[PDB]
């Protein structure tokens, strides 16, 4: 589960972790909002996750749910972010309704 996965990636050599000289464990995974490999931030340790990624000029809101854990080929869904900043923020808030702050 998430707890077992979390503890294994934390104390059992997560492959994508980077150790900075200051002592902060980074995370170069493309699907993470933050580049820090802490709890509730690494996508592998949390079933529910949300992040923003772009391939073309368009920005996309990437999120995953337990409905697709069994099928990694369809793990992450995306929606056009309505690159108008004011509209984009409200769209993100509506999409993440009831999600963790």
């Amino acid at each position: 589960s998430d707890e077992i996965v979390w503890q294994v990636i934390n104390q059992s050599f997560c492959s994508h972790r980077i150790k900075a000289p200051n002592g902060q464990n980074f995370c170069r995974n493309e699907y993470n909002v933050t580049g820090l490999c802490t709890r509730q931030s690494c996508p592998l340790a949390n079933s529910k996750y949300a992040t923003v990624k772009c391939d073309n000029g368009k920005l996309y809101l990437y999120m995953k749910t337990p409905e697709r854990a069994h099928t990694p080929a369809k793990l992450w869904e995306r929606i056009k972010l309505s690159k108008n900043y004011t509209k984009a923020l409200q769209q993100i808030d509506e999409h993440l309704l009831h999600w963790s702050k």
């Binding site: 707890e3 854990a69 099928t71 990694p72």
Partner: protein, 343 residues
């Protein structure tokens, strides 16, 4: 009963055929046990090495004792050659007898309990069922249609590598095969010239129930390894003591896994073996803590951070504002000054 995993054809299409969860992936995951067992086992394939016993002894030297104002280390006799007068038999001497020579009877293999070995193998097998754990292992399984990956038994019948590699690419293993053959880097250190010249990352693991040619077809493609359900080598399932290898199973092998490792109906198929019992019912502690029953008998919590109080000591007798707080009578005191009262 248990959930079911769809069987995928050699072209990537998910066949209607489905098999129940073998109940082996539900076994406890113990990284410590797996690491210890892997460390113990990896020393089994160790060839003994030792320094020649006759080395250093092939020298005639005796200590001069005293009176010559030189070190008492024994020195080779004779003369003319030049080696005469040089230290011998000393670990600190050039060309001497090294201290603590490595003997051939040093321990090389580590005894491991059979039950612990089976526990480690079961934990390694179970770890493969978690995509996140497999992703943390470095395998490019981001595009696999399903996990654990189940394929039709006809894969075992492939005789040509050209067809096996195409099937692996179609099913989704193309990313892992590309990762292999790319990380091939020349050995770092003195291993360059000890037959350990090249190294590469591990590729996908193929599990089969019967051998018909797949083992030979897949041996040539780098990174890909083939193993039988009966064996299920731990060194291959969790290379480097790290759990979560990308493993491809055949539906026939998926069914045979229940017999090989046992289930709730077939006990073990092994004499006296039984899957370890979990000591925790719910894997994640958050559900237990966040459960309604526990939360209903839990006192309220703070703001997650203690608010600093009295961060700086205000000194009375000055800063009248703080003085009034300590003693409200100070206002009445100052009303008449309370100090120049006339008798």
């Amino acid at each position: 009963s248990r959930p079911q995993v769809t069987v995928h054809s050699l072209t990537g299409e998910a066949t209607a055929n489905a098999l129940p969860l073998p109940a082996v992936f539900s076994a406890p995951i113990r990284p410590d046990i797996v690491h210890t067992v892997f460390t113990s086992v990896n020393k089994n394939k160790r060839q003994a090495y030792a320094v020649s016993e006759k080395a250093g002894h092939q020298t005639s030297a005796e200590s001069w004792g005293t009176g010559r104002a030189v070190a008492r280390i024994p020195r080779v006799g004779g003369g003319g050659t030049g080696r005469s007068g040089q230290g011998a038999f000393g670990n600190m001497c050039r060309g001497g007898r090294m201290f603590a020579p490595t003997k051939t009877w040093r321990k090389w293999n580590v005894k491991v309990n059979h039950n612990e070995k089976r526990y480690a193998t079961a934990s390694a097998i179970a770890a493969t069922a978690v995509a996140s754990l497999v992703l943390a292992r470095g395998h490019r399984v981001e595009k696999i249609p399903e996990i654990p990956l189940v394929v039709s038994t006809d894969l075992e019948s492939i005789q040509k590598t050209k067809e096996a590699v195409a099937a692996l690419k179609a099913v989704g293993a193309h990313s892992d095969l590309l990762k292999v053959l790319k990380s091939k880097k020349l050995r770092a250190g003195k291993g360059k010239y000890r037959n350990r010249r090249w190294t590469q990352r591990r590729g996908p693991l193929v599990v089969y129930a019967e051998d018909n040619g797949i083992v030979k077809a897949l041996r040539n493609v780098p990174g890909v390894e083939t193993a039988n359900v009966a064996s299920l080598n731990l060194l291959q399932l969790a290379p480097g003591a790290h759990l979560g290898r990308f493993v491809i199973w055949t539906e026939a092998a998926f069914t045979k896994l229940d017999q090989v490792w046992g289930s709730e109906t077939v006990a073990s198929s092994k004499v006296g073996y039984t899957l370890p019992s979990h000591i925790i019912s719910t894997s994640d502690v958050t559900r237990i803590i966040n459960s309604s029953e526990i939360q209903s008998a839990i006192r309220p919590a703070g703001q997650a951070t203690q608010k600093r109080t009295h961060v700086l000591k205000k000194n009375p007798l000055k800063n009248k504002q703080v003085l009034l707080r300590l003693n409200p009578y100070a206002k009445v005191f100052a009303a008449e000054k309370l100090g120049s009262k006339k008798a």
